């Protein structure tokens, strides 16, 4: 759902990130928190960014007048495992 | 129309500062600065990536350069402070890249035209 | 300074020139990023050669790069007129620097 009012603010907001490197595709329901400085050349990087040596998260930059493909929308993904467990969540 | 357009044919006093403009035609990646004094030979000043926010020095300009850019005017700016008469060149852009591709070359494709900053008192 | 390239460079219509940039390990030996331009006085440099031996679009074949230890070398196989400029070689230095060449005005002979 749209969420410009909540997560948006005058001047954009800067507290969301994602990351835009990575050296391999994640897995399912993989989480990489790690701030790696990113080596995209050949270069060694050496910890510094620089050429072709990026930082690997980068900020959204919510501004409240951003048309709405670019607004910040809020997910939330449920999943049901079954597994050879008792289920213990069920409804009426 | 992938062009360069760089403004300006400024004139300033020793020890001002100076900021050059280049506005982007088409995609462009990272734009980077190289000077050239008049008759001597090229160097390179700095690289920025607007769409990551680095921004690069050369040691020797420490301190006196400041390269910004504006996405909404798609422009990028270079600011050289403390001139003095061995900063008289001519500056130019450099793309660095296309709009795709977040590689780095370092072979800079299209080039603006001259920006001639004469220093003098 | 900084780099060695030989300022005058010289050859005749047909032949082959080949223009030397000579750097350390640290600079053009150690790595893959390396530029070739030409500049006629009173333009802009152009693009000719970039990643050592790689021609951009619309550069004929007779710009070749190469590259050999400490010393990357730029091939003009097939010599004219118009070739009459200044050849500047660029290299990664490091992590936030890159370092250009002494140029060398290369004249055709004939």
């Known amino acids: 759902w749209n969420s410009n009012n909540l997560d948006s603010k005058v001047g954009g907001n800067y507290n969301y990130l994602y990351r835009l490197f990575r050296k391999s595709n994640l897995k399912p329901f993989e989480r990489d928190i790690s701030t790696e400085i990113y080596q995209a050349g050949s270069t060694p990087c050496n910890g510094v960014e620089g050429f072709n040596c990026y930082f690997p998260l980068q900020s959204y930059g919510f501004q409240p007048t951003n048309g709405v493909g670019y607004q910040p929308y809020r997910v939330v993904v449920l999943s049901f495992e079954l597994l050879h467990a008792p289920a213990t969540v069920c409804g009426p | 129309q992938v062009q360069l357009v760089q403004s300006g044919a400024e004139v300033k006093k020793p020890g001002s500062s100076v900021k050059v403009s280049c506005k982007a035609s088409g995609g462009t990646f990272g734009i980077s600065w190289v000077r050239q004094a008049p008759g001597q030979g090229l160097e390179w000043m700095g690289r920025i990536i607007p769409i990551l926010g680095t921004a690069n020095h050369a040691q020797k300009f420490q301190g006196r350069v400041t390269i910004t850019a504006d996405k909404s005017t798609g422009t990028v700016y270079m600011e050289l402070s403390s001139l003095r008469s061995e900063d008289t060149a001519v500056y130019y852009c450099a793309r660095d890249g296309d709009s795709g591709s977040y590689y780095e070359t370092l072979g800079f494709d299209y080039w603006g035209q001259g920006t001639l900053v004469t220093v003098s008192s | 300074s900084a780099l060695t390239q030989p300022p005058s460079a010289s050859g005749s219509p047909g032949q082959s020139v080949t223009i030397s940039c000579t750097g350390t390990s640290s600079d053009v030996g150690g790595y893959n990023y390396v530029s070739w331009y030409q500049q006629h006085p009173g333009k802009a440099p152009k693009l000719m050669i970039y990643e050592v031996n790689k021609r951009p679009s619309g550069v004929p074949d007779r710009f070749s790069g190469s590259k050999s230890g400490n010393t990357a070398s730029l091939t003009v196989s097939g010599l004219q007129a118009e070739d009459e400029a200044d050849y500047y070689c660029?290299?990664?230095?490091?992590?936030?620097?890159?370092?250009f060449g002494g140029g060398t005005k290369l004249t055709v002979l004939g």
């Open positions: 660029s290299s990664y230095a490091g992590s936030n620097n890159l370092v």
